[PDB]
Amino acid sequence: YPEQYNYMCDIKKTLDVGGNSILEMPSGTGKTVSLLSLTIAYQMHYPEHRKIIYCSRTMSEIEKALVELENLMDYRTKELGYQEDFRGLGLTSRKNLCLHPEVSKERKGTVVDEKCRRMTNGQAKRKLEEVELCEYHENLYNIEVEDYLPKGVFSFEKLLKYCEEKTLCPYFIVRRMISLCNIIIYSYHYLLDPKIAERVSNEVSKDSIVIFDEAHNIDNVCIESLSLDLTTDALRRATRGANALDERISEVRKVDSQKLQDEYEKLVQGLXXXXXXXXXXXXXXXXXXXXXXXXXXXXXXXXXRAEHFVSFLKRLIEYLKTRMKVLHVISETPKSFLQHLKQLTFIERKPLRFCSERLSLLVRTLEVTEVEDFTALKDIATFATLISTYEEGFLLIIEPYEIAVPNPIMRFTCLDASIAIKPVFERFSSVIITSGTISPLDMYPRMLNFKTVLQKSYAMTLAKKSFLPMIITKGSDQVAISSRFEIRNDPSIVRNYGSMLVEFAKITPDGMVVFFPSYLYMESIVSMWQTMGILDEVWKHKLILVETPDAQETSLALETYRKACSNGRGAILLSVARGKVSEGIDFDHQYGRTVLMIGIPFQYTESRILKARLEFMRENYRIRENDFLSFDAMRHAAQCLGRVLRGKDDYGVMVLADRRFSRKRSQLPKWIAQGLSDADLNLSTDMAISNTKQFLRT
Amino acid sequence: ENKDMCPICKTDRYLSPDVKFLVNPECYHRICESCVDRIFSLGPAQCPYKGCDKILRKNKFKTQIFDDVEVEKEVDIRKRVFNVFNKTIDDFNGDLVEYNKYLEEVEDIIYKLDHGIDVAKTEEKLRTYEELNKQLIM
Ligand code: SF4
Ligand SMILES: [Zn+2]
Ligand SMILES: [Zn+2]
């Protein structure tokens, strides 16, 4: 198609010249473009030069990229008849890419890597001075396994079944195949991870093309890289962890103190560099991204052992308890907090080097490690590494006392996001940035400063198949104003709005998905609604996303949606744009043909974080009180707009309330503003015009 | 604790706890105001904290935010010995090895003081304090 062909030419010229490009792709028709453009762009140079580094935000997009990549393999193998070196490595979740926890553990928690470290330590201990090896090991590093992938694609599911048949473990296959430089499909939380980005950065060996897919929550991921809430219980886990460290000190000092002195000599002689250069296949700890930290010559507590580290650690956690037991409102400057700490007790600005080393020493002296104590020690260790370094833009904040019991909390505020993304513009080039929910695309040259080119979407045809109306008059124009407050006002008006949702849902009974700015309105209309005929006549049942989302509940709600729409029933999907699961799988009538939006998206205000980042961005780009109520809400609404668009062969309609939507842009800017009662008959005609123009335009 | 803060005034929570609870550095024992004031007011005698025999002196008290007696003693002795050693042969030229070795020696001295060993090495550390003070006077 010519429209996507233009984006192919843009990707070509930006990959051949520019080092980074902001490309705006139309929603639903821009996923398969870059996947083939990158491969052909690799074949025109020479077959193995740059590799695809596709980055998504969810796992569903990773699976879609895997099956579409398989469509690329079949596409290139069915048109030429020649077999080439296949690519495609599926890097997914650790719990989903492991087989043993499904045989004995029967758990899908985040502690599967700890059990994997127990098995790996079992292998190392059966190869040194002596649990079993695991299920199958010692044959995952051979050439045959290194060639099972280039000869045949085994990614994720095919790798899970292939490992279940060939009696292998997929974790070491993927880990050993990161250096093979295949098409890696991982998420943003792995490229910028203060524990994963280092090893991945050391295995990919750079020199590739990075593809930022749906790069609209990049600031959200850079924010989520820090901010850890200290909620008084971590102080108890740190106290019990310090007691466990004292017991371990009594154990290593009781009988076996030679290994601690030998490793201590390894620290005095070769320091952290030798300690990390000698150990292989050993569990590591957290770090504030060593490539971004750039701090060498880590001295081990001014050349000291473990008793001094646990003494200064007890003093440090006691100082933390002292700083967390205060009045109520108090803000901290990370420099003033470090100076106050120095006034309490001298410890200098080197507890970072004192944590990254002592944690590894304790690991080298521990054989039975408790998970909660070690986890709390890793939390306090991260807090130390981030009060010792990284201060520009960092802002320690104490949550106020609001009952005062449920209160002693201390959160650290992260720094400028440009710093975190920075290394990719030295490691790499021609980083393609594609997103279908960006409008306007000027807040990415502004916020996050980087020199790039701007390419907007140039595809807009068959406007009769993309019904895009907006509702302004709700029959009284009183719910659009009351539906914009943080706390709802006049419950009777909200009940009238819900009645309007009952009338609208009754008018168009063909799959409805409703998005809310928060769960307060949902919990207010679901308690006592004075009506339920929509569930009793057209919808049979209603689908509600819990304010505390669950994986199995959401999965049963989505499968219930597909089966309900495949039985000719339909169901209303009351979800939150700010909640979990942003979806993205459409291209069928099983999804909501009509989508309802309750006003415009809103972010929770009256929070210390929004004021800290508010004044920070105010000092940075001077975009105060203007972009945090239109850019974020524009992205959250665009997440709902992207679900309506699903190819030109399909149709749909999305109703946006509130006049304030005119102040923001939108994908395909062709919108007509009228009432809701008129939109009922208008949609009643569109449900037939969309069915008439299909065979006429074909 | 809320159940022990003075052998006579161990439970003053329902009596409007408006009095502080001082701790003498030569006892490490909590005594409420109305008791300790009479203690050092009638003469420097020992407190009856669970049969305590160490003499409580007049004044020379301190406010405690409670960081355990071990860490409080280690930070008091730590600061005192840190002031006795001062900065002798520290930032004199910029060396990192000998500096960290001397800091290791100082922290080992503070360790031997907070542990006590057998009341033999600590006396040698006291003679080291007199020697360092003699070097600071000159
Ligand atoms: S070797 Fe594989 S199956 Fe065994 S614990 Fe590790 S990841 Fe799990
Ligand atoms: Zn008393
Ligand atoms: Zn006493």
Swiss-Prot record, chain A:
Q: Which residues form the Helicase ATP-binding domain?
A: 1-263
| SMART domains hit by this protein | DEXDc2, HELICc2
Reaction catalysed by this chain? Couples ATP hydrolysis with the unwinding of duplex DNA at the replication fork by translocating in the 5'-3' direction. This creates two antiparallel DNA single strands (ssDNA). The leading ssDNA polymer is the template for DNA polymerase III holoenzyme which synthesizes a continuous strand; ATP + H2O = ADP + phosphate + H(+)
Effect of knocking it out? Essential, it cannot be deleted.
**Where in the cell does this protein reside?**
Nucleus
Q: Which residues bind [4Fe-4S] cluster?
A: C98, C116, C134, C169
Q: What is the effect of changing K31 to R/A?
A: Loss of ATPase and DNA helicase activities but not ssDNA-binding or ATP-binding, impaired removal of pyrimidine dimers. Loss of RNA:DNA helicase. Extremely UV-sensitive
- The record lists ATP as bound by M25, P26, S27, G28, T29, G30, K31, T32
**How does the activity vary with pH?**
Optimum pH is 5.6 for both helicase and ATPase activites, suggesting they are coupled.
Sequence motif DEAH box, residues: 213-216
Q: What more does the entry say? A: Present with 14400 molecules/cell in log phase SD medium.
NCBIfam families the record matches: rad3
Q: How does it assemble?
A: Component of the 7-subunit TFIIH core complex composed of XPB/SSL2, XPD/RAD3, SSL1, TFB1, TFB2, TFB4 and TFB5, which is active in NER. The core complex associates with the 3-subunit CTD-kinase module TFIIK composed of CCL1, KIN28 and TFB3 to form the 10-subunit holoenzyme (holo-TFIIH) active in transcription. An additionnal subunit, TFB6, plays a role in the dissociation of the SSL2 helicase from TFIIH after transcription initiation.
Q: What does this protein do?
A: ATP-dependent 5'-3' DNA helicase. Component of the general transcription and DNA repair factor IIH (TFIIH) core complex, which is involved in general and transcription-coupled nucleotide excision repair (NER) of damaged DNA and, when complexed to TFIIK, in RNA transcription by RNA polymerase II. In NER, TFIIH acts by opening DNA around the lesion to allow the excision of the damaged oligonucleotide and its replacement by a new DNA fragment. The ATP-dependent helicase activity of XPD/RAD3 is required for DNA opening. In transcription, TFIIH has an essential role in transcription initiation.
Protein's UniProt name = General transcription and DNA repair factor IIH helicase subunit XPD/RAD3
Protein encoded by which gene: RAD3
UniProtKB/Swiss-Prot annotation, chain B:
From what organism does this protein derive?
Saccharomyces cerevisiae (strain ATCC 204508 / S288c)
Q: What is the protein named? A: RNA polymerase II transcription factor B subunit 3
Q: What does this protein do?
A: Acts as a component of the general transcription and DNA repair factor IIH (TFIIH or factor B), which is essential for both basal and activated transcription, and is involved in nucleotide excision repair (NER) of damaged DNA. TFIIH has CTD kinase and DNA-dependent ATPase activity, and is essential for polymerase II transcription in vitro.
Shown chain mapped onto the complete sequence: 8 to 145 of 321
Other noteworthy facts: Present with 3050 molecules/cell in log phase SD medium.
Q: Where in the cell is it found?
A: Nucleus
Residue ranges of the RING-type zinc fingers?
A: 6-53
Assembly with partners or alone: Component of the transcription factor IIH (TFIIH) holo but not the TFIIH core complex. Component of a complex consisting of KIN28, CCL1 and TFB3; the KIN28-CCL1 dimer is known as the TFIIK complex.
* Taxonomic superkingdom: Eukaryota
